Paper text:
Among these factors, proliferating cell nuclear antigen (PCNA) forms a trimeric ring (sliding clamp) around DNA and directly enhances the activity of proteins involved in replication. Several enzymes bind to PCNA via the PCNA-interacting peptide-box (PIP-box) motif, including DNA-dependent DNA polymerases, flap endonucleases and DNA ligases involved in DNA replication. Analysis of the A. pernix genome showed that the sequence contains three PCNA genes: ApePCNA1 (APE_0162), ApePCNA2 (APE_0441.1) and ApePCNA3 (APE_2182) in the KEGG database. The sliding clamp of A. pernix forms heterotrimers and enhances polymerase activity in the ApePCNA1–ApePCNA2–ApePCNA3 and ApePCNA2–ApePCNA3 complexes.
The crystal structure contains a single ApePCNA1 subunit within the asymmetric unit. The crystals did not contain a threefold axis and the subunits did not form a ring-shaped trimeric structure. The ApePCNA1 subunit is composed of N- and C-terminal domains and a long loop called the inter-domain-connecting loop (IDCL) that connects the two domains formed by Leu130–Gln145. The PCNA rings from other species have an inward α-helix region. The positive surface charge of the α-helix region suggests that ApePCNA1 has an α-helix region located in the inner part of the ring that interacts with the negative charge of the DNA double helix like that in other species. In general, the C-terminal side of the sliding clamp is considered to be the direction of DNA replication, and a group of enzymes responsible for DNA replication bind to the binding pocket near the IDCL. Interestingly, the N-terminus of ApePCNA1 interacted with the cleavage groove of the adjacent ApePCNA1 molecule. In this interaction, the carboxyl group of the N-terminal Asp8 is connected to Arg57 of the neighboring subunit by a hydrogen bond. The hydrophobic side chain of Leu7 is placed in a hydrophobic pocket formed by Met53, Leu60, Pro137, Pro241, Leu257 and Ala259 in an adjacent subunit. The consensus sequence of the PIP-box is QXXhXXaa, where X is any amino acid, h is a hydrophobic amino acid and a is an aromatic amino acid. The 4-EATLDSEF-11 sequence in the N-terminal region of ApePCNA1 is similar to the consensus sequence of the PIP-box. Furthermore, the N-terminal region of ApePCNA1 was suggested to be an anchor sequence that induces PIP-box binding. These results suggest that ApePCNA1 has an unknown function mediated by an N-terminal anchor sequence that results in PIP-box-like interactions.
Residue numbers in the entry: 5 to 262
């Protein structure tokens, strides 16, 4: 027994901003149908690949980013398996200042959303298969921090004229461009004089192509961060990291079009 008198069969609980959680959920739903969240003393983590193994999403909310957070004493790790379409339903109404509370046991997951009304949901805790790529030294030849709205608008424009986007980094610039025969070719060239280019480090030149449809879906989460940290190498995966001011983090990995 604990000094808590409410919800004493649950193994973990947290409280968080429902609107930010809705944005984190949506970011995952672009990649995964079902996700396995893990709750530990460090906070909340999810990582998984889509079925084609072409894209990955990784969510981290440090325990210090939560309004409240605790785990039962006999437990180091608590899994939360959930379908992302169902979870969007739970937090669909969310506005600024609405709080979400989540309590987790092995067989069930309680969600309480404080919105216009108090919404309560009780979900089964799903068994979810996690697939992740092999853990190796991923080397990135090129890294750039860019204002996220500029990347999103670039991808919008590229998609007008083709379905592949090329990232071209030289020593002192980053070019994002459409390819293929439709005209005019769209090109956003950033240099260290561009306000949009916060930082650029290029170890070696890198040129890679990616599915713009997929990247566009990924940039849906741009409204959680002012800037995006991009990393890539020639004919290797692009990594994109969105760092929220509250400390939560969304990372994506996207395999190249070859």
């Amino acid at each position: 027994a604990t000094l808590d008198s409410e919800f004493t069969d649950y193994k973990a609980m947290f409280r968080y901003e429902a609107k930010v959680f809705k944005e984190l959920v949506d970011s995952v739903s672009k990649i995964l149908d079902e996700g396995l969240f893990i709750i530990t003393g460090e906070g909340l983590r999810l990582r998984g690949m889509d079925p084609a193994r072409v894209a990955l999403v990784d969510i981290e909310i440090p325990s210090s980013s939560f309004f409240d957070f605790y785990m039962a004493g006999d437990v180091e790790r608590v899994e939360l398996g959930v379908n992302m379409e169902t979870l969007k339903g739970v937090v669909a109404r969310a506005k600024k200042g609405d709080q979400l509370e989540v309590r987790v046991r092995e067989d069930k997951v309680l969600f309480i959303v404080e919105s216009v009304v108090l919404r309560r949901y009780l979900l089964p805790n799903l068994e979810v298969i996690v697939d992740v790529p092999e853990d190796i030294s991923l080397e990135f030849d090129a890294t750039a921090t860019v204002i996220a709205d500029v990347v999103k608008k670039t991808l919008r424009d590229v998609e007008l004229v083709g379905d592949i986007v090329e990232f071209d980094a030289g020593e002192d610039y980053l070019s994002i461009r459409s390819v293929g025969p439709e005209r005019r070719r769209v090109e956003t060239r950033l240099t260290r004089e561009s306000p949009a280019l916060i930082d650029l480090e290029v170890k070696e030149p890198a040129t890679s192509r990616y599915d713009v449809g997929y990247l566009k879906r990924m940039l849906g989460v741009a409204k959680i961060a002012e800037s995006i940290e991009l990393s890539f190498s020639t004919d290797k995966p692009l990594k994109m990291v969105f760092k929220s001011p509250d400390g939560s983090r969304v990372t994506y990995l996207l395999a190249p079009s070859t």
